[PDB]
Amino acid sequence: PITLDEFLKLPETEPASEYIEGKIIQKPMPQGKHSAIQSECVSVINSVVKPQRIARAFLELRCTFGDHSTVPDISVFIWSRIPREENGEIANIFLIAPDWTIEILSPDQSQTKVTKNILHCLKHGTQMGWLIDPDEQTVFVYRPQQETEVFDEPDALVPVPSFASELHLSIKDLFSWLL
């Protein structure tokens, strides 16, 4: 029995807490496999979009919109959508959906909760969602009003939003980050 406004006054937790459909759900504990893919994924995206100020990928950033407050594993925002203070530095609060959300499964994660979170992002303007399953070496690709797409062939390139089109990431390259 808690509202979003009430939830946002509460202190941060480790792992972070999400406010989904009126419920407070704590994110899963960090795991080796999860961290390896997460850190390398942010690094590879930013190497492609950050130099020419196209976009920026953020680790564990809180996104509050559409009566939910979530913490995607990776949130990617195009430059024009990054909220900034008057001095030009990035704002502490993000009240908008990412342009590209990336979720990586870990043993204690709820795949149903993650899928709902990705679909909620798409409902509020997200261009693309990625659901990475390390165990199955699979990526589910989510686009607004389109059937979920499956990528699991080692040589297959995983689609990226058009602002990140210079990124050519194969399934084999992604899951090699576990090695």
Add this chain to the structure above:
Amino acid sequence: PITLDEFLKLPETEPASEYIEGKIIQKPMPQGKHSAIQSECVSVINSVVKPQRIARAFLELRCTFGDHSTVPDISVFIWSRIPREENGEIANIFLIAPDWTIEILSPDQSQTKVTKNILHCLKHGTQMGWLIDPDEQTVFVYRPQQETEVFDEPDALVPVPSFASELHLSIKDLFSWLL
């Protein structure tokens, strides 16, 4: 290292074995919660579609198509698509996709594998897929070329294919089958 033709010559297992993307994957072990929803779900669908020979819901029926051989928890076929022998009785082999596939999660089930199986059905003519998550009291609804839809409000009706439009099943009714 096995083909579909070779796989189909092999003996049946308990739990049943599926042939997906050239791999043999055994279904999860039966569980109480899973069986309660599965048995009641087949009963409720057939009470709506079997009397007027609209369709028929089958438990654990093997469906072999598009180089895969799967065993959906529940397969629903419209009357005109039920394969029949010369004498008019239902055939032992189904070489086509169900009109409606229903998958119910259980503790050892791979939600990624199930989603791939539902999406493979849609690629070969299935009208609708249901992914029931008893633990999260959620139903994911899959339609060809449409974004996945989420149903989790207790009073919400879960969509059904138009041949089964007389079925009005709420989320609360579905998960009450666990009580």
